[PDB]
Every structure is written in C-alpha cells, then in structure tokens.
Design a protein around this nucleic acid. Structure first.
Lengths: 136, 99, 25, 126, 64, 215
RNA sequence: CGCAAGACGGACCAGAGCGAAAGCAUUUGCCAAGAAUGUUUUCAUUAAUCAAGAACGAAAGUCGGAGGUUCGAAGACGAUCAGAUACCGUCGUAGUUCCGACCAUAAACGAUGCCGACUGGCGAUGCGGCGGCGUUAUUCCCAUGACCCGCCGGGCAGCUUCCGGGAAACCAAAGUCUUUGGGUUCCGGGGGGAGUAUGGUUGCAAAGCUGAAACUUAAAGGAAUUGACGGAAGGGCACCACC
RNA sequence: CCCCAUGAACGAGGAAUUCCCAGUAAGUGCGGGUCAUAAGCUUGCGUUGAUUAAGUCCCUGCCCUUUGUACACACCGCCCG
C-alpha cells in the first residue's frame, strides 16, 4: 500500500466501476488503465439475507469501506463509470446506484468524471420469458 | 361493440407491424400498441446534486443525463399506473398530459 | 380456449375411430 | 371549528342590508338591536347569527359591490358612469391611416379623402 | 453510525405518512450548516422549531 | 492473489502523451515487479487509456474520448500512440430525436504509413430556417447524395497525410465542420461529428518515429 | 485485452410509405418491375363482374440435406399449494436458422365484395405538377436546393354537424330505400344435434374440401338503461375500524 | 339474615377478542325499578380521577364519482368437464 511518487501537488485518479444490477451491487476500484485493480466489495458481502444484497443501505456501507482503501493507497479522486444492467435486459439503475455515489463523495473523495456505460444492443438475441413473458 | 375507432393503435394502410418486447412484463406486443415513454433523469437524481457538485477536482461540471426509452404493454402500463380509466365522453383526446 | 378445446378433444376421438376401422381393414 | 352558515341566514341577510342600508353601523351590538326592532325574529339565537353576517357584509360593501346584492348608491354610480364616463369624446384622433389594398377598397367605395399610407411587409407568420 | 451523535432542527414540517399516519415526514436543517438539509421520517408528534437527535446522517429518506 | 499485501509488490510508473497537447502528463499506473519469468515492462504494454479531450488539450469540449496504447516502456516513462477515438454516450444520444432523419456513412482508408483506419461519421437534418412545418425529413434520394459526399471528404483527407497529421485534424474536429458546409446546398444540416475511428493495423514499433511524437 | 460462431438490424420509426394479399426497415452495386402526375402524341370501344380452371398465400407440421449461438413445446428437477401433472426458478430434446420438396389453414378483421354516379364544412400530412410578394444556401447570379404563401390531381387519415340512414352503438357512408328497380358475383333462414355421420376427392404423414339425418328444446342472441357486485381506479369518513 | 366451626380451586391467564378521547377510562358507594320475604341484574346519581391521540384509509366497514359484467333469487350470484 505504498503511494505514488507525486500526489502532493495534484490528485491521482482511480476508476470506480459501479455495477447496480438488480439483486446485487458491485463497487470495484481499479487503476486508470484498469488492467490491474485493488479491493472489491459488494452489498451482498455486508449483509447476507439474499434480498438485501441490492439494499440502499448495504450499498452505502459498501462505499463507506471502499473509500478507506482508496486513501490507504494514495487514491483521492475517482473517475466513475456506471453500469445499469444491459445485455438485452432492463438497463435501469439499481436501488444502490444513487446510494454509493452520495456515500463515497461525502466520505471524502473528489470526483473527476461520472458517465453512463451500458452494453446496449443494436438489435440482438432473444430474451428469456417466451412470447407471453412472466405473469406471476 | 367497439371501445375505440382505432381498435389497437394506429394500423392504417399496412398489414403486419414489427413486434417489440415489453421492458418489465417481458411480453410481446406490436410496435404501435405499446405506450412509448421516453425518460430524462439526472445520474444522481438531482438530490445529492449540491453535495456532489461542491466536491470535485473541477470548478464547474454539469452532470450527464440518463436516457432510456421504455415500452410498456397493456397490462404493465395500467398496473404501474401511467394511465387510468377515463370517461366515455373524454376517451377521445390526442393531447399529452399538462406539463 | 373453451371452444378450441372442444374442437380438439373431438379431433383426438375422431382419429381413434379412424385407427380402429383401419386396423380392422 | 366547522359550521358554514345556512341558507336561511344568507338569504334574509341580503334583504335586511338592502332596505336599511343607512341604518347599519360596523359594530355587532348596534346592528343586533336594530334587527330586533325593524323586523320580527322568531328566536334570539337566530338573531345573533343573522346580525353577525349582516355586519360582515357591510364591511365589504363599502369597498365596492358584492354580487347578488345591490344598494342604492352603487346603482347611482353605475348610472353615472353609463350616461358618460369622464373620459373624452374622440374617435380616435380624427385621422385615418391605411395600408396598400385598404386604399383599393376605398376607390371602390367611390371616395378618396385624407390620404396617408404605411407600407406592410410579406408575409403571414414567418 | 459510530461517528459523533448529531443534532438537527426542524425548518418546516411536510405532512404525515406511514400506513396509518403513524410517521411524520419533516424537513430539517442540519444545525451545523443550513446549506445542508435532509428530509427524514420521524415517529413522534413533532412541531416546529424542535431539535432532534439523529444517530446518523448517512441515511437519507423521503418516504417509507 | 492470495498473498499478504501484493500492493507492496507493485512498481509505480508515469504515462506521457505525445506533444500535440498543452498538458502531456496523463497520469500514473502500476504493474507488478519483475519476476524470474514475467517482466514489468512487457506487461505494461498493450493497455488502453480512455481519456477525455478536455483533460489534455485544456481548451475544448469534454466529449470525445481517445484511446491510447502503451507501445513502449522506457525507463519509467510510458510512451503512447493513437489507437482510435470514441465519443461519449450522452452527446450522441441527445442529438437523436423524433422529427429528424439520421444520416451515416463510413469508409475504410489507409494513411501514408502502415496504419489503417475505419472512420464513422454522422449528420442530422436541420430544423430548417424558421419553419412552420411540424417535421423536417429528407427524401431517400437526397440522403444518398449526402452519404456519397460524406465518404468523398473522409477519404481525401486521410488518404493524403501521415498518421500524426490525421490526429492534428481530429483534435479540433476540423473534418466534421468541412462536411457541414459541403453538403449544405442539398439540405442544410446541423451537426457533423466523427463518432468513432477504429485503428485496424499498424506496421512495427519504429522506435525513432515513436520518440518523434514525444519530441 | 484478444479470438471464434451463429443470430440480428435497436434508438432514428410516425394515426408516415410501398405491395394483389400474405407482407416489407444497416451500406453499395447489379437485374428486371410498378403507381401517381405531366402531355393540342397514338389506337378507336378494345369494357365491367365472373361457373370451369390458374398463380401467390403467416405461424405450426412432414420428408431429405446443411447449420446449431439464442430462445425453447417435450422432458428432468427446485419451490408454492390441502393437493399442483400449473403460474415462478434452474437445466434441456424436437424446433427455432438456411437449402431443396411438400402442407393451404388463421380474430388470413376495417369482423364492412368488386366497378360506377351524385350529395356539407375545415385544417393537416405523403407524392407529382402549376403560380408568387418573401428569406436563405453557391460564382453576383441564372440552372438548383432548403423554408414561406396559395392552387390542381390522385393516396393514408382526422376533426366538425338537425345531409340522410340505423334497433341502437354509430356511419359523408353502413347516405341517395314502402317515394321500394345503376351493373354483377358469393352467401343467410329459431337454438342444438354437427363441421359430426356417410360416400367422393386431395395429401407421404398431419389433415383439408364437399357434407346429412334420426332425435331434442322455447328460447338462444344483438344494442342500450337502471341497480347490485368487483382480490378495478379516483375523492371522503368512523375508537360499533386501525394506529 | 345472624353466630361458631369447616377452609377448595386460584400464584395474573393459550389461540383469539371487547370497550373507551375529559370530570372521559378505571377505582368507589348510594337511590329507584322488580318486591309479603330478596340483587352478583338493570336504570339513575355523586365522590376519587390518569395514561395515550389531535391522525390515516393498512385492516374491518360506510358514502360519492369513473369503469367492467354472461350478475337482478342480485357473488351466500352464475356457470364448465
């Protein structure tokens, strides 16, 4: 956990890679390159209940931990990439999407960027549930 | 009887219309029967916006938006309540709801 | 569905009558 | 609280203020004793209500008219504005200004007097 | 959470909520900065100008 | 992986941009130390660095993201090379809306080196003059002219000129502005951007030419 | 970060277009075809509707090959439920894809034959042509494109109402109908029994077409109105309701 | 009704459920009614005297509008194999 060689005049930027997709939340802090990475925490790790894995408060507790490990290395600022769901699915933020952002900022982390990244199709393969969909 | 003069929605001069899949029902309906609601929102939902904008490495930066086009079907529209029953003398409107 | 099922049960029955007469021949 | 005044109060209140307009104060107690004397009231409690609303009407009527109730002096000033408002006679400075093809109409009325012009611009909307 | 106990005061009351009207939404100013404000859900019968004792401010609420 | 603190086994580095920007100091990365088989510098090549345009030039728009590959490592300095340009989602999305006709074309083109590129452009119809029309659309014939002229420009300017000069034209986005005026007569258009570029080949490292870019 | 395979053309895409109907949305080229409009060109009644007969005709299915991601009848499990061969979750064969042959059916619905004439208003939209005071784009132009204003054809629709019709719902056609007759094809006769029985005909198969009677019954059905009911929606209320 | 003797269950109540918002709940006594003899009942009266709410439509139920219906013996309805 040894710092970089300059961080006293400028900030160093990691990338957040928030996943939000339903029944879970990931936060996964990486390098700028993203070819290597550091600690990775889920909301399913804080609270096991098989339904609080996507909980708002579980996502807050997650980012509240992650933001420590940032400062432990030297990372102080974050570009952020969001990910809804995609893959021919809902593509709508989870409950713990708004949550984690608000939490990591107020813990004491600077914001560099924040964007949408979703792997949306340009018209592709059939979706589970058949012609009449679900109905329960 | 007939409850409509358009039956489904807008099929005029054409035979088959390409289908589309509901977002949440996951059902299958025509392109022109589905309620097509486009959506605009802020990333942070403009709720933590003051708390976010103040803490940054940039002086100013107005946040992106989240663009999603949702297609609901007959059942999944009524149940989530983006529509409701209307009077028999007032079904006939082409007018969006007041903004 | 009810009417379509009444037409279907009578389809399977009709097929059996055919089979039973074809068997005897 | 609750309680909105009934129709028996609001109906008769209007009559009593109209015909004894100049006999009302803006005090409860005076207007109470007056209603007892100028008319029968079949109860005392009923009187104490009808008086209080008669009072409440008389406050607003001195700031201009309340619909459905017409006192004399307001209908006076109504007529006084309607026989002539104070504002000048003039129609509207005694000069007419016309545009192209308004003048063409006037040729076909077989007249032509007091020419002026203002030149108009293409075209409707944009 | 385990951070020092907070104190925040009412600026305005909004209306009652819950499934029997048992909860009361209220808007509160953080009483250490008035540019910071959160909406909360409070059990008791609150009024105006009262001070509360929040055990966190990580939570942010807007209904139950 | 499973060892005690493998973040004390990493070696920091820096990542330098070519001299075509006001700010050339991109940032810092790390790879694992040189093992008895694996070696730091070879595992520090081949990366991608999505980076904003505003961040490096510091004079211009946020949208447009550039990919940069580390093609060589040299003594704690990671030299970069162009890899292809992208775009943001939101800008590209906001322009698309009902009552317009979207116009697109692409071309495959070669530089005057071993580089090969595959540019993708876009146009949108204008809400023409001060219309009282409730929509603006272009016929199918009209579109095919505009597409033909969107190919012509984007081959001419990239078939000529070497790799570095290509980059110089894409940074202010001179290319798109040129197309907007050249198609103007047959339908006026507002907006031209080159939404993607995809590099497909490259010759060799060419160490002398590499260092040309970084002075 | 790179690679492979098959599938597929989102957002732009709408009471918009084209097609005889079924149907038809990435680029470019090639091949033949067609409508509308313009026309002081040509032919001189060459037409309309149609037994026999003919072409095309979704999805599923059958036969023989190729291919096989994705989804998925069948099938095997996990739950829910008194039970649960179901709804829900996981896995998964036939099939889904393509090539070569068959199969002729659908709420193949506008539940509204085709051709022709006459009878209100208004604003739009797609295509062609015509006119014009205006702006804008390029060489200042002309040629031309974009917008603006108006007109004439034919096309998809809408709005409007004491034309008239209709049992009513509604409809510028479902109108011009006891004041009953423009041309012509197909087809109906209380509800069931029954698209069954039977013979014919077609098909490899699956089935399609044609298609009864004995016997039974006084109702079946359409539109509209008033109530009641709703594990429908919106308002409001009660310590015989709750907190 | 009185006197002396005799001296049981019961150690605060399972599943459920009732009533109540100010001199109100609860504690506590007295008069009337029935009455030859007799209130653990009912009907009135004082005295002592809190907690908790100032709401909501969640449950139970009721009023109004809109909508759907093969129901009108009115969903405790009707109807299928």
């Amino acid at each position: 956990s040894l710092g970089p060689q300059v961080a006293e005049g400028e900030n160093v930027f990691g990338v957040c890679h928030i996943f939000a997709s339903f029944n879970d939340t990931f936060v996964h802090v990486t390098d700028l390159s993203g070819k290597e990475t550091i600690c990775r925490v889920t909301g399913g790790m804080k609270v096991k209940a098989d339904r609080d894995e996507s909980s708002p408060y579980a996502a807050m507790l997650a980012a509240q931990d992650v933001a420590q490990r940032c400062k432990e290395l030297g990372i102080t600022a974050l570009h952020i990439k969001l990910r809804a769901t995609g893959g021919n699915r809902t593509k709508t933020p989870g409950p713990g999407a708004q949550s984690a952002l608000r939490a990591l900022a107020r813990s004491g982390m600077k914001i560099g960027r924040i964007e949408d990244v979703t792997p949306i199709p340009s018209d592709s393969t059939r979706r589970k549930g058949g012609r009449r969909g679900r109905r329960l | 009887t007939k409850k409509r003069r358009n039956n489904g929605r807008a099929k005029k001069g054409r035979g088959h219309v390409q289908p589309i899949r509901c977002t949440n029902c996951a059902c299958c309906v025509p392109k022109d029967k589905a309620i097509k609601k486009f959506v605009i929102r802020n990333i942070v939902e403009a709720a933590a916006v003051r708390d976010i904008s103040e803490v940054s490495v940039f002086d100013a930066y107005v946040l992106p938006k989240l663009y999603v086009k949702l297609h609901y079907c007959v059942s999944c529209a009524i149940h989530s309540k983006v529509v409701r029953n209307r009077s028999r003398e007032a079904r006939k409107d082409r007018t969006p709801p007041p903004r | 569905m009810r009417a379509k099922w009444r037409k279907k049960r009578m389809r399977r029955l009709k097929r059996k009558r055919r089979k039973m007469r074809q068997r005897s021949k | 609280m609750g309680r909105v005044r009934t129709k028996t109060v609001k109906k008769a209140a209007r009559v009593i203020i109209e015909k004894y307009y100049t006999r009302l104060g803006n005090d409860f107690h005076t207007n109470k004793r007056v209603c007892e004397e100028i008319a029968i009231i079949p109860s005392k409690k009923l009187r104490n209500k009808i008086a209080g609303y008669v009072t409440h009407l008389m406050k607003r009527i001195q700031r201009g008219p309340v619909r459905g109730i017409s006192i004399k002096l307001q209908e006076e000033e109504r007529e006084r504005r309607d026989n002539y408002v104070p504002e000048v006679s003039a129609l509207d400075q005694e000069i007419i200004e016309v545009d192209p093809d308004t003048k063409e109409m006037l040729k076909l009325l077989d007249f032509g007097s007091l020419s002026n012009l203002q030149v108009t611009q293409p075209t409707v909307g944009m | 959470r385990v951070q020092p106990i907070k104190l925040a005061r009412v600026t305005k009351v909004l209306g009652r909520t819950g499934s029997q009207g048992q909860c009361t939404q209220v808007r509160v100013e953080f009483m250490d900065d008035t540019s910071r404000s959160i909406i909360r859900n409070v059990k008791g019968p609150v009024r105006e100008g009262d001070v509360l004792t929040l055990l966190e401010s990580e939570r942010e609420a807007r209904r139950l | 992986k499973k060892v005690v603190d493998p973040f004390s086994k990493k070696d920091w580095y820096d990542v330098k941009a070519p001299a075509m920007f006001n700010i050339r100091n991109i940032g810092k990365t790390l790879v694992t130390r040189t093992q008895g088989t694996k070696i730091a510098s070879d595992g520090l090549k081949g990366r991608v660095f999505e980076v904003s345009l505003a961040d490096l030039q510091n004079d211009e728009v946020a949208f447009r993201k550039f990919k940069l590959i580390t093609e060589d490592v040299q003594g704690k300095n990671c030299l970069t090379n162009f890899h292809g340009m992208d775009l943001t989602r939101d800008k590209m999305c906001s322009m698309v809306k009902k009552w317009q006709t979207m116009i697109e074309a692409h071309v495959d083109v070669k530089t005057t080196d071993g580089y090969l590129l595959h540019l993708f452009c876009v146009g949108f119809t204008k809400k023409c003059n001060n219309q009282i029309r409730k929509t603006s659309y272009a016929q199918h014939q009209q579109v095919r002219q505009i597409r033909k002229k969107m190919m012509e420009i984007m081959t001419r300017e990239v078939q000529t000129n070497d790799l570095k000069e290509v980059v110089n034209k894409l940074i202010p986005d001179s290319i798109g502005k040129d197309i907007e005026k050249a198609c103007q007569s047959i339908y006026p258009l507002h907006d031209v951007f080159v939404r993607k570029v995809k590099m497909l080949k490259k010759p060799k490292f060419e160490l002398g030419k590499l260092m040309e870019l970084h002075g």
